[PDB]
Amino acid sequence: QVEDDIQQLLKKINELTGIKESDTGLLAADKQTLQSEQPLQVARCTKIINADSEDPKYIINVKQFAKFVVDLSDQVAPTDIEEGMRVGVDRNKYQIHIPLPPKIDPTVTMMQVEEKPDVTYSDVGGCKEQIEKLREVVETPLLHPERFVNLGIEPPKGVLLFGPPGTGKTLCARAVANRTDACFIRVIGSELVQKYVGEGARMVRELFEMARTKKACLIFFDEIDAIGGARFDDGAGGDNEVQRTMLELINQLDGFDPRGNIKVLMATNRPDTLDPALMRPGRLDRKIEFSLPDLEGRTHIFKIHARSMSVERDIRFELLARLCPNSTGAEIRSVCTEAGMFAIRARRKIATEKDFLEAVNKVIKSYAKFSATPRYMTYN
Amino acid sequence: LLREELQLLQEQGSYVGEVVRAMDKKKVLVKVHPEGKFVVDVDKNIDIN
Amino acid sequence: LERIKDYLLMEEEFIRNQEQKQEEERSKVDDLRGTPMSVGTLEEIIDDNHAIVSTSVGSEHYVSILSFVDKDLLEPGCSVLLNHKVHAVIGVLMDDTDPLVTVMKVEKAPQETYADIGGLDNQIQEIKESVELPLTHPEYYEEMGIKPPKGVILYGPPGTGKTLLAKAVANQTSATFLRVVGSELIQKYLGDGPKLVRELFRVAEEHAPSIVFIDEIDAIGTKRYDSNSGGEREIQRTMLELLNQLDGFDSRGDVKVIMATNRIETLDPALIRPGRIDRKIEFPLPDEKTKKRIFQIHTSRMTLADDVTLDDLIMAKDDLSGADIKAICTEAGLMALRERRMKVTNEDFKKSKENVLYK
Ligand SMILES: Nc1ncnc2c1ncn2[C@@H]1O[C@H](COP(=O)(O)OP(=O)(O)OP(O)(O)=S)[C@@H](O)[C@H]1O
Numbered sequence: 115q116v117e118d119d120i121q122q123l124l125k126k127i128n129e130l131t132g133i134k135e136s137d138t139g140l141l142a143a144d145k146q147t148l149q150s151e152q153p154l155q156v157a158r159c160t161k162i163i164n165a166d167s168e169d170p171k172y173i174i175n176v177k178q179f180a181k182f183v184v185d186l187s188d189q190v191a192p193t194d195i196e197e198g199m200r201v202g203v204d205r206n207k208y209q210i211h212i213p214l215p216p217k218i219d220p221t222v223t224m225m226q227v228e229e230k231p232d233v234t235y236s237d238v239g240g241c242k243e244q245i246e247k248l249r250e251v252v253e254t255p256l257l258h259p260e261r262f263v264n265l266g267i268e269p270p271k272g273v274l275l276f277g278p279p280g281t282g283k284t285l286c287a288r289a290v291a292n293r294t295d296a297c298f299i300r301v302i303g304s305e306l307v308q309k310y311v312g313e314g315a316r317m318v319r320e321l322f323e324m325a326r327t328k329k330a331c332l333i334f335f336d337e338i339d340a341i342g343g344a345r346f347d348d349g350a351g352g353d354n355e356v357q358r359t360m361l362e363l364i365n366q367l368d369g370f371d372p373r374g375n376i377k378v379l380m381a382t383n384r385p386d387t388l389d390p391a392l393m394r395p396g397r398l399d400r401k402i403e404f405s406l407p408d409l410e411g412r413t414h415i416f417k418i419h420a421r422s423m424s425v426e427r428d429i430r431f432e433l434l435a436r437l438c439p440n441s442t443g444a445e446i447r448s449v450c451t452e453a454g455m456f457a458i459r460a461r462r463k464i465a466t467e468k469d470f471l472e473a474v475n476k477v478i479k480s481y482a483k484f485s486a487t488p489r490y491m492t493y494n
Numbered sequence: 495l496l497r498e499e500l501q502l503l504q505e506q507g508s509y510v511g512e513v514v515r516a517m518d519k520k521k522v523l524v525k526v527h528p529e530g531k532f533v534v535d536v537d538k539n540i541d542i543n
Numbered sequence: 544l545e546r547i548k549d550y551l552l553m554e555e556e557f558i559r560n561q562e563q564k565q566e567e568e569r570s571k572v573d574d575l576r577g578t579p580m581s582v583g584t585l586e587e588i589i590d591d592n593h594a595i596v597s598t599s600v601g602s603e604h605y606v607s608i609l610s611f612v613d614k615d616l617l618e619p620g621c622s623v624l625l626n627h628k629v630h631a632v633i634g635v636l637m638d639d640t641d642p643l644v645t646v647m648k649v650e651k652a653p654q655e656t657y658a659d660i661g662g663l664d665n666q667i668q669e670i671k672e673s674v675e676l677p678l679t680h681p682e683y684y685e686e687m688g689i690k691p692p693k694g695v696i697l698y699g700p701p702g703t704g705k706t707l708l709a710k711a712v713a714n715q716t717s718a719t720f721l722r723v724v725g726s727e728l729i730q731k732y733l734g735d736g737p738k739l740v741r742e743l744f745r746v747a748e749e750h751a752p753s754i755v756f757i758d759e760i761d762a763i764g765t766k767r768y769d770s771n772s773g774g775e776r777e778i779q780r781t782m783l784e785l786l787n788q789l790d791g792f793d794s795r796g797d798v799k800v801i802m803a804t805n806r807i808e809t810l811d812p813a814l815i816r817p818g819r820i821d822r823k824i825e826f827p828l829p830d831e832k833t834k835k836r837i838f839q840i841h842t843s844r845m846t847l848a849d850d851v852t853l854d855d856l857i858m859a860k861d862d863l864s865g866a867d868i869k870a871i872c873t874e875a876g877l878m879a880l881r882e883r884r885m886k887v888t889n890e891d892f893k894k895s896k897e898n899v900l901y902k
């Protein structure tokens with residue numbers, strides 16, 4: 115009341131007090147500058163075919179209009195007007211002014227990440243060797259090109275990941291994407307499936323355009339089974355456009371002037387229908403895999419999901435881990451959350467051991483008819 | 495005098511266009527015939543309603 | 544007595560909210576702008592306050608901007624305002640409106656509430672505690688720091704009330720409802736599945752807290768169509784896109800997802816893992832007690848002639864659902880208004896029973 119009425123009086127006193135400046139002072143924040151931008155130029159952009167000899171004498175296809183032979187203006191450099199270069203050309207006299215970056219196909223612009231999702235390395239504990247190897251590949255050359263040069267090696271420019279579903283692949287990728295420091299570029303595997311023939315090829319072209327422009331970047335591939343796994347050939351002509359997309363992914367990855375400062379991470383759920391051209395190292399070098407957390411892994415993942423929740427700390431966690439022999443971290447998360455939900459049945463602020471036992475026999479033994487991994491452990 | 499008003503035919507032409515929907519500040523949005531769209535003005539005589 | 548001073552100062556703040564030369568500056572902005580404001584299309588943005596646009600024919604221009612409106616409302620694939628004489632960026636255009644949104648978003652209070660559901664009482668509290676109590680009462684979860692359960696699968700034999708449960712959640716709500724039947728993910732063009740999926744969840748994540756209800760999704764695998772490209776090797780990619788869109792990257796957000804099936808054993812279990820979907824709920828054919836509630840409520844608004852017994856109808860079919868009950872309770876009325884009557888006799892139910900069941 116007193117805070118409310120006094121804050122209303124003070125804030126509206128400042129408001130109605132500046133109202134004197136509002137009704138007394140009589141956009142223009144740029145108006146004179148914008149009218150000095152009226153002697154500027156419309157500057158239509160184009161595409162260059164070739165140059166001529168002894169003179170500039172440049173040749174240009176605009177985009178649709180025609181093709182013209184032009185000359186350069188005086189405020190240009192006679193060097194960086196090379197072929198296949200989107201340059202801004204005068205509308206009246208048809209003269210080249212500024213070279214620019216090329217066409218990027220803007221539906222490919224929206225897969226750079228532009229943010230950082232907050233996932234810390236602490237969330238994948240119990241997978242120490244995998245974290246170690248993937249750290250060794252991804253983090254270390256971008257932050258320390260010291261051991262890799264003074265000993266004279268090349269780090270493995272590609273790492274694939276696999277395992278059963280829900281094992282931490284996506285989560286490890288996001289953990290890298292927190293501490294990446296590079297131009298991390300997401301690619302869903304279904305992004306390369308378009309209506310028209312050979313269009314996903316051009317998407318891969320533009321991906322590696324962006325990759326070669328910006329040095330020291332990361333590209334993440336995700337569920338590469340849609341991108342293409344096998345070249346089953348019959349008298350039907352079936353899955354073929356996907357196959358050409360996969361081949362164009364092969365060649366512009368690694369071979370005949372290799373890739374540069376780019377690292378590719380792939381992640382699949384079923385690494386078994388893959389053409390062994392991808393299985394050739396030099397493209398996909400380290401086969402890092404995620405098995406199930408055996409015994410102590412689930413203790414540690416209980417420590418992960420349990421460290422910031424309202425429980426009774428007098429209980430143990432090892433007995434909880436001993437009842438989950440073939441289980442993923444997702445099922446662990448469901449156990450923790452569902453034990454909380456059983457605590458919401460009553461009105462308590464701390465869990466009990468019986469709540470977690472209800473959670474175990476609620477998740478595992480009940481929904482074990484679905485359970486997602488009796489037919490992916492065999493990697494069908 | 496109506497026949498001597500023939501300097502009216504000799505002036506210019508006029509377009510036919512399709513309205514998507516209007517907006518604030520006494521304007522509309524018109525997609526003329528083959529081309530794109532244009533935020534244009536009304537005359538004095540027509541209702542925005 | 545705080546009402547007087549609080550109201551006076553709050554109305555002063557509201558009138559100073561409307562109190563935000565100046566008309567000369569408006570006229571100067573109108574002088575900079577042309578009157579035939581032409582519409583363009585961005586392709587890229589260059590940081591030096593002039594960028595590339597794209598006209599409706601394909602011509603493209605490096606044009607400056609009349610920078611008073613927020614240019615950072617604009618991305619690739621946006622609609623701008625341009626001039627005829629200098630082609631310069633006049634400013635931002637508000638977004639085009641909205642066939643996918645208007646089709647896929649249920650706007651209205653969409654039917655009856657929990658007073659119509661027939662005796663479940665346990666499934667109801669589960670979907671309640673998974674959607675209603677989280678969203679409408681987001682205070683318990685702060686106390687324990689436990690994230691709400693994400694996905695809910697409704698399943699069971701046909702006629703049990705999945706559609707009713709979805710409609711009842713959509714009744715008592717505070718969030719934007721998004722309904723897509725799962726059979727609309729099979730297109731006769733190649734590469735149209737992921738476009739639908741990304742647009743659907745783009746709508747969901749951009750608009751509001753929401754409930755995306757996706758019904759009869761099991762028919763996406765067990766129904767091949769001649770009006771299609773290469774079937775299973777596109778359907779699988781569509782399911783994979785739905786998978787990655789559902790539990791992929793970049794901080795998923797405030798989007799609830801409820802799906803409903805008839806059969807569940809023909810599903811790819813990669814959707815059915817937790818982390819995506821946490822609650823799986825069975826809908827069985829109930830009992831011979833909550834049937835009394837179903838016949839009662841579906842006869843609660845009619846001039847029932849009291850010479851009938853509902854226990855004559857409960858015993859009739861051993862595995863009848865609420866579908867059969869609605870069918871009989873409406874077909875008896877159709878027999879009633881066939882002969883210009885109001886009240887419904889026993890032989891009406893007999894003919895309705897012999898019409899619904901055994902034909
Ligand atoms: N080893 C783990 N330790 C801790 N949390 C884990 C672990 N594995 C999985 N989780 C949790 O469960 C979630 C599911 O893992 P994800 O990697 O997202 O699954 P996934 O990689 O999408 O598997 P798919 O379906 O084959 S793509 C993670 O985001 C974590 O929240």
Ligand SMILES: Nc1ncnc2c1ncn2[C@@H]1O[C@H](COP(=O)(O)OP(=O)(O)OP(O)(O)=S)[C@@H](O)[C@H]1O
Nearest residue numbers: 660661701702703704705706707759837865866869
């Ligand atoms: N438990 C119930 N109590 C009352 N009416 C019910 C019940 N179950 C179904 N109904 C009736 O059935 C109609 C709703 O149909 P649903 O049972 O939801 O159909 P459905 O089998 O779920 O269709 P699907 O989802 O494609 S299998 C309502 O109009 C009700 O009259």
